[PDB]
Amino acid sequence: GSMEGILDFSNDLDIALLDQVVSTFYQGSGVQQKQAQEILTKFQDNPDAWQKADQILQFSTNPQSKFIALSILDKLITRKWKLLPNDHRIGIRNFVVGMIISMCQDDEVFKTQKNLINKSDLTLVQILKQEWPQNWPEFIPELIGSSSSSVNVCENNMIVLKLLSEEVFDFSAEQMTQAKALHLKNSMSKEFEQIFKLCFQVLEQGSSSSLIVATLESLLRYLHWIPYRYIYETNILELLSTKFMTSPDTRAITLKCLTEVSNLKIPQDNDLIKRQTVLFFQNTLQQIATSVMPVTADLKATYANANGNDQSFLQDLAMFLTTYLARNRALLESDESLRELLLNAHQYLIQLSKIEERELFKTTLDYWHNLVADLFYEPLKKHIYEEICSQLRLVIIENMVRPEEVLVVENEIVRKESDTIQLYKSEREVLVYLTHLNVIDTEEIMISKLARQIDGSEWSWHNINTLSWAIGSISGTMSEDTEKRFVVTVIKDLLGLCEQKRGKDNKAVVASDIMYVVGQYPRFLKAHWNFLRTVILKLFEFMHETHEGVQDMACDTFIKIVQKCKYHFVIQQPRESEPFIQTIIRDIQKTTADLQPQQVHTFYKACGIIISEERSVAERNRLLSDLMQLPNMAWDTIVEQSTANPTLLLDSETVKIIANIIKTNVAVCTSMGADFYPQLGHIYYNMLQLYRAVSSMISAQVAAEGLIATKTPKVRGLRTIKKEILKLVETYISKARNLDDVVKVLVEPLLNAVLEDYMNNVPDARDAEVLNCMTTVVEKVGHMIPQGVILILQSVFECTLDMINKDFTEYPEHRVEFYKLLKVINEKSFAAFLELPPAAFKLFVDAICWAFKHNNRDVEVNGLQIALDLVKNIERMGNVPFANEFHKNYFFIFVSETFFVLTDSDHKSGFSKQALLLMKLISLVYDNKISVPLYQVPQGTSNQVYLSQYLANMLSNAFPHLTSEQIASFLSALTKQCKDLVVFKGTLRDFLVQIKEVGGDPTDYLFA
Amino acid sequence: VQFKLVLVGDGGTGKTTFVKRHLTGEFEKKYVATLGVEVHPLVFHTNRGPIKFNVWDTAGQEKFGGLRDGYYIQAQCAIIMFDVTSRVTYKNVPNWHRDLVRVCENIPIVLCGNKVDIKDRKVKAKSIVFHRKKNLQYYDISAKSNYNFEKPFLWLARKLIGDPNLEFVAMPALAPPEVVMDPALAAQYEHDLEVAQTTALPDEDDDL
Amino acid sequence: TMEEDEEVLYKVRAKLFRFDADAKEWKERGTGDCKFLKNKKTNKVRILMRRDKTLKICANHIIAPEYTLKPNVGSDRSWVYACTADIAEGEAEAFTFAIRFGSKENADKFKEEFEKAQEINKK
Ligand SMILES: Nc1nc2c(ncn2[C@@H]2O[C@H](COP(=O)(O)OP(=O)(O)NP(=O)(O)O)[C@@H](O)[C@H]2O)c(=O)[nH]1
Ligand SMILES: *[C@H](CC(=O)OC(C)C)n1cnc(-c2cc(OC)cc(C(F)(F)F)c2)n1
Ligand SMILES: [Mg+2]
């Protein structure tokens, strides 16, 4: 409607109309709410709206209206406070203070408008940040006197002091300059004795449970910084550890306060302070035992029921026990009168450890790892926790989570990512430690747990899985002899389960467990060839099974076993007619008949691993020859049928066959590295012409069908050919040892194939993979092919820049690969850039600065690195025309661009390397490493002086609310510190604080 | 049975993409910075009846902050979201949680590490611990992969309804009507249909 | 839940899109099990498909015999077809649906099952 009326400030505001807009926003709906929101924003952002704050806070019937009004004062206080005339300041102060006392003397407002008082308290604190204590020296002494007058004022001042403590110590770092935070930190420290006094009396005196909670909430923030004396030389620890643990209204905040206490490093030579650290632990554990739960309570059941504040308190308890014991358990390990206290606390953690709540489990597991590592090195300690650890052995074995390798899941046994992965690794680490602490007890549990799977006593998928994963995880902890017996007595026992469970679902389950275990015990397989052979053969059988999960895992296991047992497949073992590699290669086609292509490739990759163990070149190159028989035959047939009739590649089934051929080569080359060259030479020349062939088909299709053709299966299939080919070459060159063959055999036939085709193709048909391949080539060979690097630059530089220099989103994969390529070139073959024409070298600089302003960190970090290595490359040239022409033409471009990203609040993630770049630039001038004048100002003037003038003028126009003195001091301190990075960073960070407010103090830049 | 849900976090983290994914099922690849707040109703069907969230999807960019903490008043639950591929987004979680619990002192809050689908993950799992001392629930999620995308709401619904065994349940499937095509525009619903045929489906390299 | 009195003729995992005619884009509607349900009282066959973890309906309409499965320019494993009465989100709207499967074989089997259902409804 006409909700917009409140925008017109020539009127004087209709408070009733404001409150309707507000109500229509918060309580409203649909479009009316969507229009009220936009009107309120415009109202809030009007620079004059703060003059209406007074009258909204006097006349309004709506709390939300007063809230937003205070939102408008907050923004004035934080950002333009020092601009106001002094009269308006003391005006706003008295108004804000007056309202707070006004709302805290009306007992009904104090209860019902908690948010609006809290927001006022915060607003008052913003004033203190600007005025206290230099102008308001009597704020605190008044505040403590004012607290006797009323009970509502007393607990509200506990809120103001909590907030003040957070704003000074907990959050000053990013929001204040170092000098100002130092200032308010000291100002509070000097006046804390008074504050603590009021805080201790209120606690001891006892009173309203609300005032008590508020005082404790306030105490929690003091404990982050106040000196130890206030905690240990008063009686407050006995208050927190006894009185306040009993009432459930103060119990939550008390446990937190006591967790913060526990997280201090006491002067660990003071037997009187050690006494008290033990005492408040003793008291707190007694209060839990008598007022909440005994140690035997089933905390899993409690947590699952989630009555009231149970889950929160149990989390809070877990945080308290783990924090404390991790720091102070040594206090309890010696005195025998404290032994029961030590164990009861740990038995609580045992009970906490079987709650079903992942993020809590991870909390206690972090502690257990801390404990077991200690018990594994510290002499004479583990015997204390013998009882605890046997319990823990059980908790972890019964809650093992699925490892990466296992690829079958229940939904229905079908085929969780990194959150589970990390958790499993953390359980394994504790369980390994626990196994080393008592290896008999671990086996006893595992064997008997497995003995009861045979019986069916508690057979289930969950039970057999966790047990199978625990067993696999402890590989490497037992003796080889006990392992042997143990391993043998986990497989056979596992076979008499598949033998007797039936119906696919049950057998894919045991199949995944048996596979995980055997794949985890390679040392056993190495010494028992006859069993190893039986496994690989059965693995080959699993590759023929209808269940897709089993199939996929059999391949992952095969390659897993092989990577550890390569050498037992390369030799002719006893009992055998030949090396087993030869038997595997022979039946390659039958073994892999039912596998999907990408599993077939994994199979070939495994054989490549084995082959690479044969040291005799003649034997290996024959092995490689044999392995590649199938795809080579298919390659010869498909090249002779591409030779004549270049129409044969229109067939989509032929496209897929070619692709799978190249991927098989990619897969074997992955594992064989430099040993793959003979096979690459066999296909290189035909492959690169196939690459030329396919390139034309794609170009033809785009012309004949339009850009949409790139989305079609036909063309996408042909682009896969080009990509897999580049990936093969990139793969080999990255691992090659014989670089002279790379340069003289591969590189130029490669460049001729891919470069012109990339430069002359439509953008939507260019392959970013081309760039990635070239990056690898330059990295490994660039120093031997200066003309090749030049050609690569001419081929890809300008055209791909035009792709990415219109926005920040189009062609994301080219964007990243692009600056990857400019980085390596600038690092390895800088000469290629000196050969650029002046027009192209300016585009290069433009391209680098373009990288700065990316928010994508792949591009942003590379860009900054390029700029840094570029400067370094120029300076190594010394005093030479190009270096002088560089500085004159581009020194200030980089400085001003670096400053832009440092100050624009949109490139925070890169602050460190932007600071590093700007510091080097400035240190060039203040080291006189720039021998030409940087200007076009009188004669003889030093570059150090001109830089000062340039920067002072630059910042003044980009930040006109800064005073001349602020900019004068900032640059002075910034240039003095251009060899001290951390101080340098601190000065820039002080600057970024001051450009968000008016009235910044120039002396703050002398903090160093 | 409707609750207010505030959704805070740094810009680019995926707040609105996550909500849109629940409203329509779509995945939006374009980043169009939210301006102030977008309010959306969102309903889930549980075994304890329907539950409705009024999701106040807040803006992350400071230059578009709007009323800022003004959006938090009378909230009954909240999600804080960061970006596991951007360390600084996790660095600021203590700042979003700061302004959120000064206005809402006692509400269930979920902490979400979005974008776990990206493989070059920067914020490592073992380093995510802010939720411990502050009694927040934490989940790895990905609005693009749908990984754990259900869980923030399921947890919150369990905390507001007060039932730990609350579960999502299948809607009733009304019997679809019998409608014949309109021959007046049937000659024109090849226009609207050819366009669709010639516009390639997104993400043809996914598994589905 | 309202599928007591229905038989499952076919089930397949699939992703379903809807075409926004204004913005020229395909937008995902849901991913889950696509079911062909034959009502045991009326013998009419419907498509009903729910999302994976929320189980919300993202498609519910008769497999009308008027409908025709067309291919998409960029996929060999999807079909496009017009739909004039779909009550997934409430009131019977009209849509242009694309549904993609995990393989070309799944798509072809779907097309077979789709018009087998069409003849059943033609009765
Ligand atoms: N790879 C990936 N990208 C995601 C995911 N979720 C969101 N995005 C992407 O992140 C970008 C930001 O989108 P958006 O949802 O608007 O983030 P936002 O935090 O709401 N922005 P703002 O707070 O400024 O309004 C989009 O490009 C989106 O595609 C995800 O799970 N995975
Ligand atoms: C279980 C049979 C089964 O699950 O069938 C699936 C569907 C393929 N089963 C019985 N025996 C094994 C077995 C035997 C082995 O002898 C060395 C080795 C393994 C392996 F898992 F380690 F490969 C399995 N499985
Ligand atoms: Mg958004």
Residue numbers in the entry:
A (entry chain C): -1 to 376, 414 to 446, 450 to 453, 457 to 977, 981 to 1052
B (entry chain A): 9 to 216
C (entry chain B): 78 to 200
From the paper:
Exportin 1 (XPO1/CRM1) is a key mediator of nuclear export with relevance to multiple cancers, including chronic lymphocytic leukemia (CLL). Human XPO1 is a ~ 120 kDa protein comprised of 21 repetitive anti-parallel α-helical segments forming tertiary protein structures termed ‘HEAT domains’ (H1-H21). The α-helices of H11 and H12 form a groove with hydrophobic pockets that serves as a binding site for prospective cargo proteins with an exposed hydrophobic NES. Due to the over-expression of XPO1 in many cancer cells and its role in exporting tumor suppressor genes such as TP53, development of selective inhibitors of nuclear export (SINEs) that inhibit the nuclear export activity of XPO1 in malignant cells has garnered increased attention.
First generation (KPT-185, KPT-330, KPT-335) and second generation SINE therapeutics (KPT-8602) have demonstrated selective cytotoxicity for solid and liquid tumor types in pre-clinical and clinical studies. Such activity is due to slowly-reversible covalent binding with the C528 residue within the XPO1 NES-binding groove, effectively inhibiting nuclear transport of essential proteins and RNAs. Lastly, crystal structures of XPO1 (wt or E571K) bound to several SINE molecules (KPT-185, KPT-330/Selinexor, and KPT-8602/Eltanexor) show the compounds binding similarly in each case, which was further confirmed by a similar cytotoxicity profile from this class of compounds in patients’ cells with or without an XPO1 mutation. The structures of KPT-bound E571 and E571K XPO1 were very similar. Comparison of wildtype and E571K XPO1 with all three sets of KPT compounds gave pairwise Cα r.m.s.d. values less than 0.18 Å and XPO1 side chains were in similar conformations, implying that both wt and E571K-XPO1 will confer similar XPO1-drug interactions. In all structures, there was no density for the side chain of Glu571 in wildtype XPO1 or for the lysine side chain of E571K XPO1, suggesting they are flexible and mobile in the crystal structure and unlikely to make any persistent contacts with the SINE compounds bound in this groove. Furthermore, while the variable side chains of the SINE compounds are likely flexible (weak to no density), the trifluoromethyl phenyl triazole scaffolds are well-defined and bind similarly to both wildtype and E571K XPO1. All structural observations suggest the E571K mutation is unlikely to change how KPT-185, KPT-330 (Selinexor) or KPT-8602 bind to XPO1, and will have little to no effect on inhibition efficacy.
